[PDB]
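Replying to the earlier thread about multi-chain prediction with a worked example.

Input:
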Amino acid sequence: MNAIHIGPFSITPAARGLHYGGLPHHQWTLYYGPREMAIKTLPDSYTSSEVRDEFSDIIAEFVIDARHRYAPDVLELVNSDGDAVLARVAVSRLPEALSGCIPDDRFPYWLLTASRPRLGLPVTLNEYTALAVELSAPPLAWITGLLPGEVLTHDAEEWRPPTSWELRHVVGEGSFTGVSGAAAAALLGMSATNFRKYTAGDSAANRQKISFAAWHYLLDRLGVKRAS
Amino acid sequence: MNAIHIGPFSITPAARGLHYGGLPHHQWTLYYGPREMAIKTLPDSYTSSEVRDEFSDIIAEFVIDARHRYAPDVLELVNSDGDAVLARVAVSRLPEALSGCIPDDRFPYWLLTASRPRLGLPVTLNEYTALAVELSAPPLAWITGLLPGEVLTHDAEEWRPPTSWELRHVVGEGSFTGVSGAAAAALLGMSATNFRKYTAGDSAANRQKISFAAWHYLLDRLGVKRAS
Amino acid sequence: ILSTASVLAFERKLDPSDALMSAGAWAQRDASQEWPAVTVREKSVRGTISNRLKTKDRDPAKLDASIQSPNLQTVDVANLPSDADTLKVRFTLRVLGGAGTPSACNDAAYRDKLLQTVATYVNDQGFAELARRYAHNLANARFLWRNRVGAEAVEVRINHIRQGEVARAWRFDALAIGLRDFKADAELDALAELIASGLSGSGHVLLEVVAFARIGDGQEVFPSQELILDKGDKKGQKSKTLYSVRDAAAIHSQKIGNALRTIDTWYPDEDGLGPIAVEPYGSVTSQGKAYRQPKQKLDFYTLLDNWVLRDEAPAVEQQHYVIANLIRGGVFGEA
Amino acid sequence: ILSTASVLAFERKLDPSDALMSAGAWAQRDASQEWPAVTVREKSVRGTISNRLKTKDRDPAKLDASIQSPNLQTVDVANLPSDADTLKVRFTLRVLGGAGTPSACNDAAYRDKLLQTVATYVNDQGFAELARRYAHNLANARFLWRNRVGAEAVEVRINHIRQGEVARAWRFDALAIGLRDFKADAELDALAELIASGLSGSGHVLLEVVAFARIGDGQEVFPSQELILDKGDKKGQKSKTLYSVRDAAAIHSQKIGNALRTIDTWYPDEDGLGPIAVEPYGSVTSQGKAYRQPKQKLDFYTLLDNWVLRDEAPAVEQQHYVIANLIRGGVFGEA
Amino acid sequence: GKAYRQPKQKLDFYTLLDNWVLRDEAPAVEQQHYVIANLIRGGVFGEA
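Result:
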């Protein structure tokens, strides 16, 4: 039939139809952009929901692998013993004052990384509050690992507007944020048709590139990047 | 001579002229918005710079007053006894769960309000970091006292675009945030002239209104609102 | 060519005094010369926040913190005693002639043309409609701004003082004479003729105007309110101070003049709202809008420029508005 | 698009006078027109430590040193004489009307829409539930704030003072008519139609309200408390100052008005407390919390903006709350 | 000039009231008599 678009995922069938068993069949292909992940032979009597549910397990497995592959680093606030983890904060980036650190009794509270050669600093609760305010990761930060670096940079000259694929990562249908086009248009303050112009690609007519401030505020509102 | 635009302030001289003693003078008036402030007669010989620095005192006074007028609230992380304050965080908006509270020996950590009527909540350290992450005040949040509630709402239907004065609080010249027009243009990802159409008012030509997403991302980059 | 004069300062006519208030009882208004004055006392107010929030303060805990630390102010309050129901408001009005003559000018040609224009105005239709409306605004106690919105019965006594004694006394029921319609009455016409003779320069008119209002026993009366310096703490803020002269609560004279000037019923907008003050660009500060906008050709300055410079005489109502602006005075002219 | 007006100041209806306190005896209340006033006297208080210590004053030696330095103060006190057990409170209430019309409104069209909304309210249901609840707050002595929590018997007499004379008399029992239930009574209904005619604009309503409380012989009566400048020495500290008008203890007028305002039962919280004062965001000072939060969409501003701007008329209880806030008045709109 | 029921001995009003209400540690019957008598006498209990 036609392709099923689940966020950045495209389930497109082969135009040729086979007759496995006695019933007609089609070879359905699941792509994440240019990379295919599962080619499966499914009947022509299958509805779109059944074709979606056939690939839903591989879709959820790829989502879990993307969450566990681009998870933000974790800073642990510990006491002077350095064993009882008093607090845990997921940070988008580590403090620049971090060096190879083991806690002592010289300072009551210490901040460490969750990595095995732990990097940390002697911190107070006010300074740890300031560092957690400045550097904390947003909840859906792992989608920034599924986006190119040139659409997340904060400088104007080294920034490219995202395509329809990278927009469909976070905005509509089965996007990884989980929001729809109407909700993401409500967060940006634009109309439904104006944002549908942004989401839909194809020809250049009725298709514009999103601006720097709108894309960055959308990633701020969606909890993907720059959202402390 | 003519009005000097310093911050949101306009130093408007009087059209009529006098000659106090043997020297010419002019009634210079400091306007914050449609409201006058301190008015002093400046001799005509005075330079524009002299005029500005002369009124600089009133200018600085107002800025200080505003900062104090809109200083954000501060929650204290205290121990079970409650007398000793381990941490202080400048909140943007008070949490929605605190009530009349005083630290109890039962809980090691308690969040309380800086005021006498100490309303708070018993939280652990990770919940303290979570609350500090989602409700921290940005460093220049006091300017949100000078802006009305319509231009600071996150809902687009209740959102009103800023005027020339409200935008002119925090864009260029001797602003409250201290940034320039080119710096505010580079923060928003576009060139200086397109931001100069946003800054300059008067006639409808070169008076494009800034969008909701661009205004909120600009407030994010200047550390005035939503910058946690 | 008759260019516009630079300075056009006009002296105010119908000069009122600071209207002192005192307290007393109804049917003792004849012996009201010995009434004790209304004193401005101080009382403490504690309040919660009732204004609109800025959507940053729509946080529930911010609201509860504002309630738990309520605002404390001291307010100057003016009240009658518990045995006094009638408020007595007394002032004096000086109606002067020479309305068209400016106090200052920068052109003898402009002064001569303005004097000639006012002269031909008075020859075709003198200060008859304007003095009728001023006598109406004297008859109804519009100088009792918030001392009439709940008043049970208002009486206005206007005495013409000639050589230190009364020449003619007019008594008016200020509630029957409404704040909307400019009707005609014989006593109102006599007061109109007196104010006409005062404005024409044919006599000296001094009036003692005394208003008795049934505010109620012990009720709050409303004088004029002064500046607030805000030089202290936020607890003893002194958020409101009222106007008194020597331990006697009073209304500002410009408020009485504004109430007398509320005669304008010829603005380009609908006049069913009610009369407004004659003032350039026809403003009322409560409604926040300016009737007789400068873009329309019905404000005072454009009508004056059409009437004087190029001799386009406006309609008779608009020329009454222009002459009423000349009567009320002001710093006219550009800079 | 019919946005809200930026300036939406409203004058208050139901204006109460200052509530004068006097002293007397029970069964002499039919002739209580000569009763001596309660005088704010002074008494000295010596105190030891009775507050929570912040973990550093809890040492025995430091606590005993704080005990050996007692905090001596002088407090303004209001007590009845030893032969007087009844406290009389007298105030006048003036019902104005025109609660729909704002004192200030920037937007004409918004003013017309709000007037049409109040007019369609009154055409649906007039000022009848609100006037009944205000009359209930008149009947019970809720204006006797702490002079009713231990009173044996309270009685309220309300007179309709039309032309300086009693047009209609009402006598009530303030303990039978509780502070929780808005029931129905014939005299209460007659007072409700009188307040209804006052609030609609049918007539002028002035009510003289007299209250008698069986506190006890020589007991402490509680007037409104003033604000302390805190400038003198710590010995004569003057920690508490009561409110008096002329050597005579009294309650503040806005306290009486808040107690009459205590009719709001339709807040989304339960009926365990009872009626609260009709405030924007339903604030209660004693509980330190706000019923009718903006988050739960039952504050005055959200209900009024739904009712006026987008024609989303709320339930009739919320309509009563909105019109009761309009009667209460305030500086609504964005500053 | 000497305080019995010192907060060191945990027999004052505030510790007993907090243990009674928050931790539900009901004290001796005479001590809850004392606590309710303190509530009868009134106060500005709470933060000061």
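The longest helix of chain C spans residues 108-124.

Feel free to reuse this layout for your own posts.
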